[PDB]
Design an enzyme around this catalytic site. Structure first.
Site, PDB file in Angstrom:
ATOM      1  N   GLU A   1       0.797  -1.231   0.000  1.00 31.13           N
ATOM      2  CA  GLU A   1       0.000   0.000   0.000  1.00 31.13           C
ATOM      3  C   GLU A   1       0.830   1.282   0.000  1.00 31.13           C
TER       4      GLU A   1
ATOM      5  N   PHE B   1     -11.645  -7.463  13.893  1.00 33.40           N
ATOM      6  CA  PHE B   1     -10.628  -7.952  12.969  1.00 33.40           C
ATOM      7  C   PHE B   1     -10.155  -6.831  12.042  1.00 33.40           C
ATOM      8  N   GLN B   2      -8.846  -6.603  12.017  1.00 37.81           N
ATOM      9  CA  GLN B   2      -8.246  -5.575  11.172  1.00 37.81           C
ATOM     10  C   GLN B   2      -8.843  -4.180  11.349  1.00 37.81           C
TER      11      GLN B   2
ATOM     12  N   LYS C   1     -17.576  -1.188   5.941  1.00 39.65           N
ATOM     13  CA  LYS C   1     -18.030  -2.247   5.047  1.00 39.65           C
ATOM     14  C   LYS C   1     -19.549  -2.295   4.868  1.00 39.65           C
TER      15      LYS C   1
ATOM     16  N   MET D   1      23.825  10.712   2.432  1.00 45.54           N
ATOM     17  CA  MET D   1      23.483  11.944   3.118  1.00 45.54           C
ATOM     18  C   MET D   1      23.770  11.850   4.615  1.00 45.54           C
TER      19      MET D   1
HETATM   20  C1  LIG Z   1      -6.762 -14.808   7.998  1.00 46.00           C
HETATM   21  C2  LIG Z   1      -7.044 -14.848   9.479  1.00 46.00           C
HETATM   22  C3  LIG Z   1      -7.911 -15.869   9.967  1.00 46.00           C
HETATM   23  C4  LIG Z   1      -8.078 -16.059  11.375  1.00 46.00           C
HETATM   24  N1  LIG Z   1      -8.780 -17.167  11.775  1.00 46.00           N
HETATM   25  C5  LIG Z   1      -8.812 -17.478  13.114  1.00 46.00           C
HETATM   26  C6  LIG Z   1      -9.531 -18.681  13.560  1.00 46.00           C
HETATM   27  O1  LIG Z   1     -10.201 -19.351  12.775  1.00 46.00           O
HETATM   28  N2  LIG Z   1      -9.471 -18.985  14.936  1.00 46.00           N
HETATM   29  C7  LIG Z   1      -8.803 -18.166  15.851  1.00 46.00           C
HETATM   30  O2  LIG Z   1      -8.667 -18.525  17.024  1.00 46.00           O
HETATM   31  N3  LIG Z   1      -8.215 -17.011  15.476  1.00 46.00           N
HETATM   32  C8  LIG Z   1      -8.184 -16.636  14.136  1.00 46.00           C
HETATM   33  N4  LIG Z   1      -7.561 -15.436  13.721  1.00 46.00           N
HETATM   34  C9  LIG Z   1      -6.749 -14.652  14.724  1.00 46.00           C
HETATM   35  C10 LIG Z   1      -7.688 -13.763  15.399  1.00 46.00           C
HETATM   36  O3  LIG Z   1      -7.958 -12.571  14.664  1.00 46.00           O
HETATM   37  C11 LIG Z   1      -7.226 -13.280  16.800  1.00 46.00           C
HETATM   38  O4  LIG Z   1      -5.878 -12.620  16.538  1.00 46.00           O
HETATM   39  C12 LIG Z   1      -6.876 -14.394  17.835  1.00 46.00           C
HETATM   40  O5  LIG Z   1      -8.070 -15.333  17.828  1.00 46.00           O
HETATM   41  C13 LIG Z   1      -6.734 -13.796  19.166  1.00 46.00           C
HETATM   42  O6  LIG Z   1      -6.381 -14.890  20.068  1.00 46.00           O
HETATM   43  P1  LIG Z   1      -6.150 -14.629  21.589  1.00 46.00           P
HETATM   44  O7  LIG Z   1      -7.444 -14.112  22.108  1.00 46.00           O
HETATM   45  O8  LIG Z   1      -5.808 -15.891  22.144  1.00 46.00           O
HETATM   46  O9  LIG Z   1      -4.966 -13.602  21.829  1.00 46.00           O
HETATM   47  P2  LIG Z   1      -4.985 -12.011  22.046  1.00 46.00           P
HETATM   48  O10 LIG Z   1      -5.732 -11.387  20.975  1.00 46.00           O
HETATM   49  O11 LIG Z   1      -3.571 -11.596  22.227  1.00 46.00           O
HETATM   50  O12 LIG Z   1      -5.817 -11.779  23.282  1.00 46.00           O
HETATM   51  C14 LIG Z   1      -5.295 -12.293  24.550  1.00 46.00           C
HETATM   52  C15 LIG Z   1      -6.267 -11.960  25.638  1.00 46.00           C
HETATM   53  O13 LIG Z   1      -5.613 -12.505  26.797  1.00 46.00           O
HETATM   54  C16 LIG Z   1      -5.497 -11.484  27.772  1.00 46.00           C
HETATM   55  N5  LIG Z   1      -4.234 -11.764  28.582  1.00 46.00           N
HETATM   56  C17 LIG Z   1      -2.918 -11.393  28.051  1.00 46.00           C
HETATM   57  N6  LIG Z   1      -1.908 -11.656  28.815  1.00 46.00           N
HETATM   58  C18 LIG Z   1      -2.448 -12.208  29.917  1.00 46.00           C
HETATM   59  C19 LIG Z   1      -1.959 -12.777  31.272  1.00 46.00           C
HETATM   60  N7  LIG Z   1      -0.680 -12.794  31.563  1.00 46.00           N
HETATM   61  N8  LIG Z   1      -2.930 -13.299  32.231  1.00 46.00           N
HETATM   62  C20 LIG Z   1      -4.352 -13.295  31.945  1.00 46.00           C
HETATM   63  N9  LIG Z   1      -4.899 -12.805  30.758  1.00 46.00           N
HETATM   64  C21 LIG Z   1      -3.926 -12.274  29.774  1.00 46.00           C
HETATM   65  C22 LIG Z   1      -5.440 -10.169  26.973  1.00 46.00           C
HETATM   66  O14 LIG Z   1      -5.332  -8.954  27.622  1.00 46.00           O
HETATM   67  C23 LIG Z   1      -6.554 -10.431  26.033  1.00 46.00           C
HETATM   68  O15 LIG Z   1      -7.859 -10.132  26.486  1.00 46.00           O
HETATM   69  C24 LIG Z   1      -7.401 -15.169  12.336  1.00 46.00           C
HETATM   70  C25 LIG Z   1      -6.610 -14.096  11.822  1.00 46.00           C
HETATM   71  C26 LIG Z   1      -6.370 -13.953  10.431  1.00 46.00           C
HETATM   72  C27 LIG Z   1      -5.338 -12.913  10.003  1.00 46.00           C
HETATM   73  C1  LIG Z   2      17.978  15.563   1.518  1.00 47.37           C
HETATM   74  C2  LIG Z   2      17.166  16.837   1.375  1.00 47.37           C
HETATM   75  C3  LIG Z   2      17.867  18.062   1.154  1.00 47.37           C
HETATM   76  C4  LIG Z   2      17.144  19.264   0.845  1.00 47.37           C
HETATM   77  N1  LIG Z   2      17.883  20.362   0.466  1.00 47.37           N
HETATM   78  C5  LIG Z   2      17.215  21.479   0.004  1.00 47.37           C
HETATM   79  C6  LIG Z   2      17.986  22.656  -0.434  1.00 47.37           C
HETATM   80  O1  LIG Z   2      19.214  22.710  -0.287  1.00 47.37           O
HETATM   81  N2  LIG Z   2      17.247  23.742  -0.959  1.00 47.37           N
HETATM   82  C7  LIG Z   2      15.850  23.732  -1.024  1.00 47.37           C
HETATM   83  O2  LIG Z   2      15.244  24.640  -1.595  1.00 47.37           O
HETATM   84  N3  LIG Z   2      15.123  22.697  -0.547  1.00 47.37           N
HETATM   85  C8  LIG Z   2      15.751  21.562  -0.044  1.00 47.37           C
HETATM   86  N4  LIG Z   2      15.001  20.463   0.451  1.00 47.37           N
HETATM   87  C9  LIG Z   2      13.494  20.453   0.240  1.00 47.37           C
HETATM   88  C10 LIG Z   2      12.931  21.182   1.371  1.00 47.37           C
HETATM   89  O3  LIG Z   2      12.812  20.397   2.560  1.00 47.37           O
HETATM   90  C11 LIG Z   2      11.511  21.766   1.145  1.00 47.37           C
HETATM   91  O4  LIG Z   2      10.640  20.558   0.817  1.00 47.37           O
HETATM   92  C12 LIG Z   2      11.327  22.695  -0.099  1.00 47.37           C
HETATM   93  O5  LIG Z   2      12.415  23.755   0.012  1.00 47.37           O
HETATM   94  C13 LIG Z   2      10.012  23.333  -0.027  1.00 47.37           C
HETATM   95  O6  LIG Z   2       9.891  24.162  -1.227  1.00 47.37           O
HETATM   96  P1  LIG Z   2       8.604  25.000  -1.488  1.00 47.37           P
HETATM   97  O7  LIG Z   2       8.492  25.951  -0.338  1.00 47.37           O
HETATM   98  O8  LIG Z   2       8.838  25.653  -2.732  1.00 47.37           O
HETATM   99  O9  LIG Z   2       7.310  24.104  -1.602  1.00 47.37           O
HETATM  100  P2  LIG Z   2       6.213  23.724  -0.495  1.00 47.37           P
HETATM  101  O10 LIG Z   2       6.879  23.188   0.672  1.00 47.37           O
HETATM  102  O11 LIG Z   2       5.220  22.858  -1.184  1.00 47.37           O
HETATM  103  O12 LIG Z   2       5.632  25.027  -0.024  1.00 47.37           O
HETATM  104  C14 LIG Z   2       4.870  25.803  -1.002  1.00 47.37           C
HETATM  105  C15 LIG Z   2       4.390  27.059  -0.345  1.00 47.37           C
HETATM  106  O13 LIG Z   2       3.658  27.681  -1.413  1.00 47.37           O
HETATM  107  C16 LIG Z   2       2.342  27.941  -0.964  1.00 47.37           C
HETATM  108  N5  LIG Z   2       1.406  27.851  -2.179  1.00 47.37           N
HETATM  109  C17 LIG Z   2       0.989  26.536  -2.686  1.00 47.37           C
HETATM  110  N6  LIG Z   2       0.184  26.541  -3.699  1.00 47.37           N
HETATM  111  C18 LIG Z   2      -0.028  27.844  -3.963  1.00 47.37           C
HETATM  112  C19 LIG Z   2      -0.848  28.696  -4.978  1.00 47.37           C
HETATM  113  N7  LIG Z   2      -1.584  28.114  -5.891  1.00 47.37           N
HETATM  114  N8  LIG Z   2      -0.796  30.156  -4.910  1.00 47.37           N
HETATM  115  C20 LIG Z   2       0.008  30.833  -3.904  1.00 47.37           C
HETATM  116  N9  LIG Z   2       0.783  30.165  -2.941  1.00 47.37           N
HETATM  117  C21 LIG Z   2       0.746  28.685  -2.996  1.00 47.37           C
HETATM  118  C22 LIG Z   2       2.073  26.858   0.110  1.00 47.37           C
HETATM  119  O14 LIG Z   2       0.868  26.802   0.777  1.00 47.37           O
HETATM  120  C23 LIG Z   2       3.349  26.969   0.858  1.00 47.37           C
HETATM  121  O15 LIG Z   2       3.440  27.963   1.860  1.00 47.37           O
HETATM  122  C24 LIG Z   2      15.666  19.258   0.808  1.00 47.37           C
HETATM  123  C25 LIG Z   2      14.988  18.038   1.122  1.00 47.37           C
HETATM  124  C26 LIG Z   2      15.697  16.826   1.343  1.00 47.37           C
HETATM  125  C27 LIG Z   2      14.874  15.542   1.452  1.00 47.37           C
HETATM  126  C1  LIG Z   3     -10.069 -14.153   7.253  1.00 46.01           C
HETATM  127  O1  LIG Z   3     -11.207 -13.351   7.463  1.00 46.01           O
HETATM  128  C2  LIG Z   3     -11.698 -12.508   6.405  1.00 46.01           C
HETATM  129  N1  LIG Z   3     -11.009 -12.512   5.167  1.00 46.01           N
HETATM  130  C3  LIG Z   3     -11.511 -11.673   4.126  1.00 46.01           C
HETATM  131  C4  LIG Z   3     -10.810 -11.675   2.883  1.00 46.01           C
HETATM  132  N2  LIG Z   3     -12.651 -10.855   4.311  1.00 46.01           N
HETATM  133  C5  LIG Z   3     -13.312 -10.887   5.587  1.00 46.01           C
HETATM  134  N3  LIG Z   3     -14.393 -10.114   5.801  1.00 46.01           N
HETATM  135  C6  LIG Z   3     -15.082 -10.052   6.955  1.00 46.01           C
HETATM  136  O2  LIG Z   3     -14.883 -10.664   8.022  1.00 46.01           O
HETATM  137  N4  LIG Z   3     -16.067  -9.141   6.796  1.00 46.01           N
HETATM  138  S1  LIG Z   3     -17.117  -8.731   8.011  1.00 46.01           S
HETATM  139  O3  LIG Z   3     -17.325  -7.499   7.269  1.00 46.01           O
HETATM  140  O4  LIG Z   3     -18.249  -9.535   8.386  1.00 46.01           O
HETATM  141  C7  LIG Z   3     -16.120  -8.045   9.289  1.00 46.01           C
HETATM  142  C8  LIG Z   3     -16.634  -8.430  10.578  1.00 46.01           C
HETATM  143  C9  LIG Z   3     -15.963  -7.984  11.812  1.00 46.01           C
HETATM  144  C10 LIG Z   3     -14.754  -7.141  11.713  1.00 46.01           C
HETATM  145  C11 LIG Z   3     -14.265  -6.771  10.436  1.00 46.01           C
HETATM  146  C12 LIG Z   3     -14.921  -7.204   9.224  1.00 46.01           C
HETATM  147 CL1  LIG Z   3     -14.257  -6.708   7.733  1.00 46.01          CL
HETATM  148  N5  LIG Z   3     -12.807 -11.723   6.596  1.00 46.01           N
END
Ligand SMILES: Cc1cc2nc3c(=O)[nH]c(=O)nc-3n(C[C@H](O)[C@H](O)[C@H](O)COP(=O)(O)OP(=O)(O)OC[C@H]3O[C@@H](n4cnc5c(N)ncnc54)[C@H](O)[C@@H]3O)c2cc1C
Ligand SMILES: Cc1cc2nc3c(=O)[nH]c(=O)nc-3n(C[C@H](O)[C@H](O)[C@H](O)COP(=O)(O)OP(=O)(O)OC[C@H]3O[C@@H](n4cnc5c(N)ncnc54)[C@H](O)[C@@H]3O)c2cc1C
Ligand SMILES: COc1nc(C)nc(NC(=O)NS(=O)(=O)c2ccccc2Cl)n1
Ligand SMILES: COc1nc(C)nc(NC(=O)NS(=O)(=O)c2ccccc2Cl)n1
Ligand SMILES: Cc1ncc(CNC(C)CS)c(N)n1
Ligand SMILES: Cc1ncc(CN)c(N)n1
Ligand SMILES: [K+]
Ligand SMILES: [K+]
Ligand SMILES: [Mg+2]
Ligand SMILES: [Mg+2]
Lengths: 583, 595
Positions: free
Chosen positions: A55, A117-118, A167, A478
């Protein structure tokens, strides 16, 4: 009321809204929470879809796309990790003012706040890195939220916005029908007509209008004012023109920085005076401050965002609104200047004595990175094609900015505000999608490239023939430069083990080229740019080569360190001694 | 007051606090804002430094390291993009309860709020995905903040914490003495806990069809598995674990019910649906486990309404008590510690013949069935897991398995034979694709002698494959397994089931994994033919350095059983070879032959 959407699911409405918003490309990665939308856009002919491997890639691709096209980059990802994975691209777009609309799937509204989830609090996480965000609570408000998003992302200073899509909302079916500046401009004109040593400090703002560079050139010619641009302003002014001062700032040329320090009037156009440009703020523009105290000069700021006016330095005249627009209104009020003998004489003196100097190649030595940029710049230009350049972050990025000859707007796409390593490749891919016919080159660093190199395969699947150039110095250049200068050459974890870039490119389905010898550089660069499909070229360049000039710490823009061949040789000896010959 | 730090820079104080916090490993990537700290740890022998290619990699490595060792994973990155690049790992650790201390460099305190170079409101961004975070305002408070960070990260339910470090604070020299306390790492309540324990024992002694529902919580104490087993044997209670509880109970034991949930086996799910008493130990009743909540554990609810059963919950965090379902008795605190205090109050049980007989009928009736290999067919993913489980387990070495997210992850969970604690490291709550590789690298750093295997998916692997070179540089001989079905399997499965086989952007173009591995400096292996699987798996496991093995597997194969939508845990979909064949034909027609 409107009923053209009644009977459609939130996802189908999304599909239609993209068409209405003139969206021709969507970058994204599917996931559970966003499935209702992906189903609705399945085989959609309203726009093209680009699939990255991560992403973050989608995010940077969208930024590249937006930078090259002027249209907002649209992102469509899932909930949780899908959303958190686009935080960097958003923060990056927020820093550089790039129009981007991020759509993130979200768990059902009946699951929010239950640690589902997520699930992630995306609205909260992205609050500081978006101009605005929201969570659509019902299908009825989807069209509205989408319209507000695109509007906000493209208004004022462009920026990213996020729209969280539960969703159940995108799966739901819509059942019911749904619904003074002139004063500043005048004073500005008088101050300019009164200036004896004016300088145009231009930034990215001028590029936010199709007529920006045109009017900039017009004003520069009319009042005979030299123009210097920030990193993000490069391309807005023809560097071939005698009035070009080139780039200013931390690594800008001496001429540009000196002119700014000796100018009685600084005309800031679409630039925010960031800390990479101003240098030691208290030492910034000393002559302009003196002219201000004497009411005969100072600083004029054409800024669209009120929050950026008088934020860093106090200005004398503030012209709020679009820069290009206001420049057009002020044009007539500007008196045609015959010439500026003294001003241009002093400026030309600096140019002849302070050019972008560096240690050139000697018989048997390795290739110099600066030389590679100058050569590629010419080779690329000689293709006659429209050329677009993206970069990673670091020295190679600065060298690209300094040694390339910028003349066309929207041709330099680099991460400046946030400075995100790994931006190069995905940005290039995005740019290529925006400009299919353009030659897109990513001038990258080895470390930066490693960050997002998985997107190489994405370039192939997307059909984008990007040209990837890697200036390999086997180091985070750099950072080592700062370590060499400020930390007694203590290279703390700034050397990553690189994979074989050529074999990597081939594994990813691209052509791979490598150059080690000077005598082969010319031919390799030619084959590189003339290759039909995507291609990667690695050039082994010299190591521990500092980017100069340089202004850092409390130094003023005029207190910069320049290149010196004898000093470089002394530093090499010292470095070898301190690193036991390792570097 | 303490004056021993007077004269040191914030960076040097950081370095010193690491050894006082027993930190032996740090995962990070340098940058401008964090330079003062990096210069201070330059060549430091207080700990091993691991460099990834991307900060997200450092974060997942730290998680894997934490999951394998029980120690907090430490991350050290720069400001701006360095910090935003660790948001996913933090959100991932927050969801799964993984102890992690993230240190992010920040712009000088005087530049904060000015939109400075590489400045980000990291404390604001990570607020919702950290147990706690803070920005150190002065060098004087550095020791205090570090100590609070480590304590919060490792107490209660473990989780991630973030400490923002302004460049001027770490470069600053401490010129003021500071409180010694800040530099050093109830009868009524205990009586109340004992009361709930006695109440829990009484309920358990009354149960006729009990089931232990175990999760990650039991693994947060070294004696958890032992005490769980003791209770299980003493009261003859069958045990089912969540995905995150796998490894806490020996699956070779007759009383093991295997995994429950969305993709758990029918026996575990049915046992939970028919139990009169559910004893939840360190599990949070998440939505991938309970199925339709209103249909969850009907017999336990009936028992509660009749005062003869219900649900007991050994939970450490108040936030997860009575959050999803009403429980009859909540035993607050560390599960392991509380099971120890309750043991003597549990009446020894001779046998549960009827309950066990019913459970065994379910085991014979609902095994993890799937379409096995046939002449000329491609290798089956489920078969790879079963074979590898045996080959790896047979080595006699300590085996640790990490995974990506998706079908391969579920098949690994179902078909591997789990027996040892802290041997399954997977992303469950947030489900972060790309977790597999870096987590394996971190796990290997934590356990240098263990055989570390990453059972990955092709799409998940693409997310973070750049870390392959990091494995070589770190000297971690991880074994990367890619069950390549050339698709985002878990998503295509849902598209097949709920979107009439419309695969919208779920097929990414893969690079040549073997050439990729070689380019990255690892040994690369590929298997396509059934006849070569055994030999390749053996070569894979016995290779000495890092190695990647790609196994081309059959496509569009669903993970079953499956409980989704409004279905209850007992309303699962089961494997049926006839249905798979019909669905295959239906798929080819609907996709116009593309899939
Ligand atoms: C593609 C996908 C599919 C999935 N399918 C499944 C599935 O089918 N089945 C499944 O089980 N999971 C599944 N998951 C994982 C799931 O989303 C949860 O991450 C997982 O079930 C969480 O398990 P957990 O509750 O054991 O651990 P956690 O989420 O880490 O939760 C632990 C819990 O234990 C408590 N706790 C922590 N430390 C202590 C301690 N020392 N003493 C007392 N309590 C404590 C926490 O505070 C919390 O409430 C899936 C995930 C993905 C990415
Ligand atoms: C390794 C590194 C080294 C760098 N060295 C240098 C260097 O030596 N010299 C240097 O110049 N820069 C350097 N930079 C880049 C620097 O950090 C700034 O990103 C850059 O100077 C910003 O330039 P800017 O002000 O022109 O643009 P911006 O930061 O985008 O600022 C634009 C300004 O214009 C205004 N403005 C925007 N659109 C409009 C519009 N339509 N009409 C009127 N006003 C508008 C904004 O709102 C803002 O105040 C370096 C960056 C890195 C990563
Ligand atoms: C592995 O679980 C999984 N994988 C995909 C690709 N999609 C989804 N979707 C899903 O669970 N959708 S849901 O909208 O019913 C949902 C419920 C609770 C929390 C989040 C989501 Cl997205 N699941
Ligand atoms: C290219 O600029 C750069 N590169 C490195 C490797 N380090 C730094 N550091 C820097 O600018 N430090 S600073 O602390 O004076 C600073 C001032 C204002 C805003 C942020 C930062 Cl870090 N710069
Ligand atoms: C993504 C990312 N990580 C780290 C840095 C750090 N600093 C540099 C310029 C090099 S190692 C960066 N600029 N971008
Ligand atoms: C990072 C990431 N992206 C997407 C998905 C969705 N299937 C995921 N689980 N993780
Ligand atoms: K130039
Ligand atoms: K099993
Ligand atoms: Mg480099
Ligand atoms: Mg797959």
């Amino acid at each position: 009321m409107d009923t053209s959407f009644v009977g459609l699911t939130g996802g189908q409405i999304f599909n239609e809204m993209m068409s209405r918003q003139n969206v021709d490309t969507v970058f994204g990665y599917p996931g559970g929470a966003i499935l209702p939308v992906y189903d609705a856009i399945h085989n959609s002919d309203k726009f093209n879809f680009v699939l990255p491997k991560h992403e973050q890639g989608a995010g940077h691709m969208a930024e590249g796309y937006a930078r090259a096209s002027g249209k907002p980059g649209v992102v469509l990802v899932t909930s949780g990790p899908g959303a958190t994975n686009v935080v960097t691209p958003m923060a990056d777009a927020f820093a550089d003012g790039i129009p981007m609309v991020v759509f993130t799937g979200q768990v059902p509204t009946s699951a929010i706040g239950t640690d589902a989830f997520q699930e992630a609090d995306v609205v909260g996480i992205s609050r500081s890195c978006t101009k605005w965000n929201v969570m659509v609570k019902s299908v009825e408000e989807l069209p509205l939220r989408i319209n507000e998003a695109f509007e906000i992302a493209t208004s004022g200073r462009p920026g990213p916005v996020l729209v969280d899509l539960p969703k159940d909302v995108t799966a739901a079916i819509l059942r019911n029908p749904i619904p003074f500046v002139m004063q500043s401009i005048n004073k500005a004109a008088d101050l300019i007509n009164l200036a004896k040593k004016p300088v145009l400090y231009v930034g990215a703002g001028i590029l936010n209008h199709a007529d920006g560079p045109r009017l900039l050139k017009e004003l520069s010619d009319r009042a005979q004012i030299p123009v210097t641009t920030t990193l993000q302003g490069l391309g807005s002014f023809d560097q071939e023109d005698p009035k070009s001062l080139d780039m200013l700032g931390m690594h800008g040329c001496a001429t540009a920085n000196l002119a700014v320090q000796n100018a009685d009037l600084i005309i800031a156009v679409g630039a925010r005076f960031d800390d990479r440009v101003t240098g030691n703020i208290s030492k910034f523009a000393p002559e302009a401050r003196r002219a201000a105290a004497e009411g005969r000069g100072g600083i004029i700021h054409f800024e669209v965002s009120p929050k950026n006016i008088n934020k860093v330095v106090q200005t004398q005249i503030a012209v709020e609104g679009d820069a290009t627009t206001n420049l057009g209104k002020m044009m007539s009020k500007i008196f045609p200047v015959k010439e500026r003998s003294e001003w241009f004489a002093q400026i030309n003196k600096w140019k002849k004595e302070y050019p972008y100097a560096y240690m050139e190649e000697t018989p048997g030595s390795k290739i110099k990175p600066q030389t590679v940029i100058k050569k590629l710049s010419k080779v690329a230009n000689d293709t006659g094609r429209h050329v677009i350049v993206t970069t990673g972050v670091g020295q190679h990025q600065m060298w690209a900015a300094q040694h390339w000859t910028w003349r066309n707007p929207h041709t330099f796409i680099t991460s400046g505000g946030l400075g995100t390593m790994g931006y190069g490749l995905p940005a290039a891919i995005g740019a290529q999608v925006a400009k299919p016919e353009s030659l897109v080159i990513d001038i990258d660093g080895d470390a930066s490239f490693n960050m997002t190199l998985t997107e190489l395969s994405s370039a192939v699947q997307a059909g984008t023939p990007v040209k990837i150039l890697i200036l390999n110095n086997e180091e985070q250049g750099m950072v080592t430069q700062w370590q060499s200068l400020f930390y007694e050459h203590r290279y703390s974890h700034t050397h990553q083990l690189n994979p074989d870039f050529i074999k990597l490119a081939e594994a990813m389905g691209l052509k791979g080229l490598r150059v080690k010898k000077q005598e082969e550089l010319d031919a390799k660069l030619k084959e590189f740019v003339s290759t039909k499909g995507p291609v990667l070229l690695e050039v082994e360049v010299d190591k521990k080569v500092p980017v100069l000039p340089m202004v850092a710490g409390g130094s003023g823009l005029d207190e910069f360190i320049n290149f010196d061949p004898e000093v470089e040789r002394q530093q090499t000896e010292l470095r070898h001694k301190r690193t036991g010959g390792k570097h």
